[PDB]
Enzyme design. Structure first.
Site, PDB file in Angstrom:
ATOM      1  N   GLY A  19     -11.659  -9.190  -8.130  1.00 56.43           N
ATOM      2  CA  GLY A  19     -12.850  -8.888  -8.878  1.00 56.43           C
ATOM      3  C   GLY A  19     -12.626  -8.325 -10.249  1.00 56.43           C
ATOM      4  O   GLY A  19     -11.554  -8.438 -10.793  1.00 56.43           O
ATOM      5  N   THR A  74      -5.304 -13.353 -11.171  1.00 56.16           N
ATOM      6  CA  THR A  74      -4.568 -12.350 -10.308  1.00 56.16           C
ATOM      7  C   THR A  74      -4.230 -12.936  -8.950  1.00 56.16           C
ATOM      8  O   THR A  74      -5.014 -13.672  -8.368  1.00 56.16           O
ATOM      9  CB  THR A  74      -5.497 -11.138 -10.013  1.00 56.16           C
ATOM     10  OG1 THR A  74      -5.929 -10.590 -11.275  1.00 56.16           O
ATOM     11  CG2 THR A  74      -4.757 -10.077  -9.258  1.00 56.16           C
ATOM     12  N   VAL A 102      -5.732  -2.853 -19.648  1.00 51.32           N
ATOM     13  CA  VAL A 102      -5.070  -2.908 -18.326  1.00 51.32           C
ATOM     14  C   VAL A 102      -6.234  -2.881 -17.298  1.00 51.32           C
ATOM     15  O   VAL A 102      -7.170  -2.101 -17.418  1.00 51.32           O
ATOM     16  CB  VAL A 102      -4.136  -1.737 -18.129  1.00 51.32           C
ATOM     17  CG1 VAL A 102      -3.595  -1.656 -16.690  1.00 51.32           C
ATOM     18  CG2 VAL A 102      -2.998  -1.837 -19.175  1.00 51.32           C
ATOM     19  N   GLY A 147     -11.542  -6.028 -12.882  1.00 45.92           N
ATOM     20  CA  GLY A 147     -10.544  -4.928 -12.758  1.00 45.92           C
ATOM     21  C   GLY A 147     -11.137  -3.578 -13.032  1.00 45.92           C
ATOM     22  O   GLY A 147     -10.756  -2.558 -12.369  1.00 45.92           O
TER      23      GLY A 147
END
Lengths: 144, 141, 137, 144
Positions: free
Chosen positions: A53, A1, A30, A55
């Site tokens: 971190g 990310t 997700v 999710g």
């Protein structure tokens, strides 16, 4: 990310988050990255925050919304990131989990262009670029 | 007031910031700077947690999530989108060109294709091999 | 303290509440009460904003979204899930049976089938008709 | 959409949100109902809230997380719902949109079993069942 937040020469905030997610997740999983308030939140009267971190843990604590609301209550960016992480550590304990299994952190900016960062665990760095140039900084962390 | 200023996550944030700063240092909009900044990492196959080169799901599918938010509560998001290298820009298009704020799955891809984005193969050789390695160590089927 | 107590949205909340109350009045858990309460509306094909009988997307697909949160920050969520009448219960399965908190799309349906949920056609005749009528306008 | 929040005989909170979403939405559109902090939020030390209205606008404002933090900060459930709607109305104005085009509201419960509700527009009722019985109640609204 990657998460990114900026304050432009007009004094406006924006942000962006983008990810491939947890490696080898279940199909259709997700995380926090596409969720407003979780991975990213921006309010031009207050500030902006983006998360790092696991999710699942940022989603369950609505973490960037929490950071920006703490700035709205008067916390500086650094104070808001820390206090968000401190609330989140309490929640991890309420859950009966081991803090070592959970990483959540935040970077934050306000309308002054003051900035801050804090995480559960050591190991994260973030990049800051202003008129003093670009650099990698380390945040405070709760698990010492 | 210290402006302009950009913050981004992880060591690859340093490289994104350079891209963002090309916009911000010229008086450009924060929204444009953040989109440019994160697209660098989406585009880079050696950055294996974002976009192209991303490590797949357990079924070998590279599924991407992204969102964007501007200075006046405009937002767009895509989740679990396959085949498009630049999900931040699809999110931007959800924001600007639809009456919705979040598309997921096959609908996110269909909308991306309708906006002129092109299907690409996001699974790198490197990521495929590591995935295959994981199938063995985890014994997942 | 005023407990037990349940609140729900819209006029259809009133009958949903009676189902929730069958759990709450016997000392049952809030989580079980809210699941059963909302499942009543999911099941009802005449309530066309929830579950079975749901008005479709513009392509005629009925896609459902749900989430659940208990008393200790446990969460589960599904979104854009087709063919399963009780998305709230799949969400509860995401929460209890996976290391994830949100599944979407085909993944969500795959998971639901793996947990024993049954694939069903959720597009009613009435919602199909109204959809085709909308395609005209 | 139906959202439901409850406080059980043990004094624990839980909630559920389920929808078919906006009729004739684009394929793949997701609203607030599956988003923690938007359509639903529950914190057993504070209270719970669930949202009504246009999904996109609940997402945008992370509304249930806001309502619960307002309770955390000392507001009654009614006060929290009203304050969250008033801040959302200000955001709609900042956006240059017509308030008549936007519905957002919330229902909320605290740990004492106090409850309340509030919306931008009229036309929404909620149901409440306690030991006195089941009641259809009509909350206040800002657009007058």
């Amino acid at each position: 990310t990657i998460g990114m937040i900026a304050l432009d020469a007009q004094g406006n905030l924006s942000g962006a988050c983008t990810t491939s997610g947890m490696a080898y997740k279940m199909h259709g999983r997700v995380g926090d990255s596409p969720i407003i308030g979780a991975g990213l939140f921006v309010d031009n009267e207050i500030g902006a925050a983006t998360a790092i971190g696991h999710g699942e843990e940022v989603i369950r604590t609505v973490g960037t919304h929490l950071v920006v609301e703490l700035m709205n209550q008067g916390r500086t960016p650094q104070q808001a990131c820390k206090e968000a992480v401190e609330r989140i550590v309490k929640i991890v304990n309420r859950r009966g989990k081991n803090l070592k299994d959970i990483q959540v952190g935040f970077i934050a900016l306000n309308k002054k262009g003051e900035y801050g960062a804090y995480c559960i665990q050591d190991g994260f760095n973030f990049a800051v670029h202003d008129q003093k140039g670009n650099r990698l900084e380390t945040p405070g962390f709760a698990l010492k | 007031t210290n402006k302009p200023i950009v913050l981004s996550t992880w060591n690859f944030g340093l490289h994104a910031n350079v891209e963002a700063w090309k916009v911000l240092s010229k008086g450009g909009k924060a929204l444009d700077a953040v989109e440019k900044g994160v697209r660098l990492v989406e585009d880079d196959p050696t950055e294996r947690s974002v976009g192209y080169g991303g490590r797949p799901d357990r079924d070998g599918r590279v599924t991407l999530d992204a969102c964007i938010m501007d200075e006046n509560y405009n937002i767009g998001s895509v989740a679990c989108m396959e085949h498009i290298k630049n999900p931040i820009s699809v999110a931007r298009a959800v924001m600007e060109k639809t009456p919705h704020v979040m598309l997921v799955g096959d609908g996110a891809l269909e909308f991306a294709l309708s906006q002129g984005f092109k299907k690409e193969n996001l699974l790198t050789a490197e990521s495929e091999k590591e995935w295959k390695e994981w199938l063995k160590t985890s014994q997942y089927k």
